């Protein structure tokens, strides 16, 4: 099943769910740069 809305995804890939897209947040801390899926 696609993913969710904030879903812990990859630059590489993207099976975030139809209108989410895998994008890096805005900002958050130094270590961490983990990918979500956001609303496209």
């Known amino acids: 099943g696609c993913k969710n809305l904030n879903s812990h ?3 590489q890939h993207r099976e975030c769910c139809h209108g989410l897209v ?3 947040p805005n900002y958050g801390n130094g270590r961490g740069i983990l990918w979500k899926c956001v609303r496209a």
Do not use: V
């Open 9 to 11: 995804c990859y630059r």
């Open 22 to 24: 895998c994008r890096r």
